[PDB]
Amino acid sequence: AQKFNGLTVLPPLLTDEMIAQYTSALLAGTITSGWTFGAGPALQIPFPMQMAYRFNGIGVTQNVLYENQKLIANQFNSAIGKIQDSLSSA
Amino acid sequence: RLITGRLQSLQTYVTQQLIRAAEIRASANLAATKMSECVLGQSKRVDFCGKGYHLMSFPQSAPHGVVFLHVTYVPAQEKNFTTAPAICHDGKAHFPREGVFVSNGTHWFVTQRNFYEPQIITTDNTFVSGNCDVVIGIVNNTVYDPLQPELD
Amino acid sequence: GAENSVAYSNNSIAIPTNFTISVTTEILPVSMTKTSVDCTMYICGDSTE
Amino acid sequence: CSNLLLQYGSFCTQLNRALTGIAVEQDKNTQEVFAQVKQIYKTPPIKDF
Ligand SMILES: *[C@@H]1O[C@H](CO)[C@@H](O[C@@H]2O[C@H](CO)[C@@H](O)[C@H](O)[C@H]2NC(C)=O)[C@H](O)[C@H]1NC(C)=O
Ligand SMILES: *[C@@H]1O[C@H](CO)[C@@H](O[C@@H]2O[C@H](CO)[C@@H](O)[C@H](O)[C@H]2NC(C)=O)[C@H](O)[C@H]1NC(C)=O
Ligand SMILES: *[C@@H]1O[C@H](CO)[C@@H](O[C@@H]2O[C@H](CO)[C@@H](O)[C@H](O)[C@H]2NC(C)=O)[C@H](O)[C@H]1NC(C)=O
Ligand SMILES: *[C@@H]1O[C@H](CO)[C@@H](O)[C@H](O)[C@H]1NC(C)=O
Ligand SMILES: *[C@@H]1O[C@H](CO)[C@@H](O)[C@H](O)[C@H]1NC(C)=O
């Protein structure tokens, strides 16, 4: 180690468990409320409606999500699997 | 040795002052950007000009610094509502143009998303796109068609 | 923080009916005292040597 | 060695203050990144999204 000559290290105030808890809480907030929990009280919204709201901010409409929701969901799940597999391979 | 030690102390002080000046430059650039966006207009960056939806900011003079009195928009009272993404009328699918479909117990209304104000579902607040089968969570109702009565 | 659970459903929404105007305070320094230091008055006193 | 470092204890104090400021700086850096919500939310037991 490197602590034998007076060069002691300081443990962080927040351990990795608390960082994991914070990230999980933020993830639950953004999948259950969208952005209202980050700008006030936490509301509730279905995820397809949040996806439609996010679609309506980039110049596209909301019916093109409700008409190919299965395609969009399969694409997102494939993307999540692909990024996990790519991360597994620094 | 006095000159060498004094030079070492002066160099250490100069490096500390330079690091402090770099930090001050970063803070001043952040303050200038905040004054350009949140004060000199309305910034769409969420959680940048304070917690909540930013409306405006009031800058005030401070000794060797600046403060910002941001005006935010945070909701207080919320309710519970059963919602649907689309509505079926006559083999057609109606979607809200600028709102959301909500029902209290037996009637369905269209309201704006960030504030509650129920309105009657007509053909002027909904748009027709497709048929009934494609949408998963579709709900039966009638659209008013405000023109029919008028044309009589 | 406060341990709370938000109810989620595929056909349930929460929209607000009231709002409060809040003022948030932020402190951002832009400058500090400017000091000028020279070696002649600091390192030396009144001696030519 | 400490008898001669009595003459450089002021530099030692400057280095100790800089190290303490660095440590509290890294302690404060984590708070502005992850501690954005003060309420700990949870996911529903049935994962139907
Ligand atoms: C849901 O909202 C509707 C509209 O606000 C309510 O319908 C009204 O109810 C009042 C109370 O008796 C009547 O006086 C009105 O004539 C009704 N309007 C119409 C157009 O029928 C309805 O009662 C609400 N339902 C629940 C369960 O609260
Ligand atoms: C919404 O309306 C449609 C059509 O008005 C209903 O679909 C009918 O369902 C019955 C029995 O469920 C069938 O016998 C008919 O053939 C269907 N017609 C069509 C055109 O599909 C549907 O059931 C209604 N949904 C609800 C929840 O009442
Ligand atoms: C929204 O919130 C405001 C703030 O509390 C409410 O205003 C209060 O209303 C009560 C009763 O009407 C008064 O006694 C208070 O003096 C009001 N406070 C202020 C600061 O004006 C308002 O009534 C709420 N609106 C709704 C629809 O709930
Ligand atoms: C009304 O709101 C409460 C708030 O938690 C919720 O538990 C309840 O399910 C809501 N009612 C309906 C019918 O969804
Ligand atoms: C919502 O999810 C529940 C449980 O999976 C299901 O029974 C119900 O049919 C769903 N409703 C819609 C509109 O998808």
Q: Please give the full DSSP string across B13-72, using - where no structure is assigned.
A: HHHHHHHHHHHHHHHHHHHHHHIIIIISS----TTTSSSSEEEEEEEEEETTEEEEEEEE
- Cβ–ligand 1 distance for B104 under 6 Å, the answer yes
In contact, A52 and B95? CB cutoff 8 Å: no
Query: How far is the centre of ligand 5, averaged over its atoms, from the C-alpha of C9 (Å)?
Result: 8
| B77, HSE (Cβ side, Cα atoms, 13 Å) | 3
Distance, in Å, from the CA atom of B45 to the CA atom of B5, rounded to the nearest integer, reads 51
Q: Is the dihedral of CA B75, B81, B82, B88 positive or negative?
A: negative
In contact, C24 and B38? CB cutoff 8 Å: no
DSSP symbol at C16: B
Q: What is the largest CA-CA distance in chain C?
A: 89
What would the 3-class secondary structure string for A16-48 be? HHHHHHHHHHHHHHHHHCCCCCCCCCCCCCCHH
User: Which residue of C10, C11, C12, C13 sits with most ligand 5 atoms within 8 Å of its CB, as the best mutation to test the pocket?
Assistant: C10
Nearest CA in chain D to C10: D49
CA-angle at D46, arms to D44 and D49, nearest 5°? 85
Q: Which ligand is nearest to the CA of B140?
A: 2
DSSP symbol at A54: H
Strands B86-88 and B138-140: parallel
Residues with Cβ within 8 Å of residue B41, at least 6 apart in sequence: none
Q: For B109, list phi and psi in degrees, rounded to 5.
A: -130, 165
| B33, HSE (Cβ side, Cα atoms, 13 Å) | 9
Say which of B6, B74, B78 has its CB closest to residue C20: B74
Element at A84 (helix H, strand E): helix A69-88
Distance, in Å, from the CA atom of B100 to the CA atom of C16, rounded to the nearest integer, reads 13
Nearest CA among C17, B90, A22 for reference residue D38: A22
Given the structure tokens 């027709």, which residue do they identify?
B128
Residues with Cβ within 8 Å of residue C31, at least 6 apart in sequence: B24, B28, B64, B65
Query: How far is the centre of ligand 3, averaged over its atoms, from the C-alpha of C19 (Å)?
Result: 10
- Cβ–ligand 5 distance for D48 under 6 Å, the answer yes
In contact, B24 and C32? CB cutoff 8 Å: yes
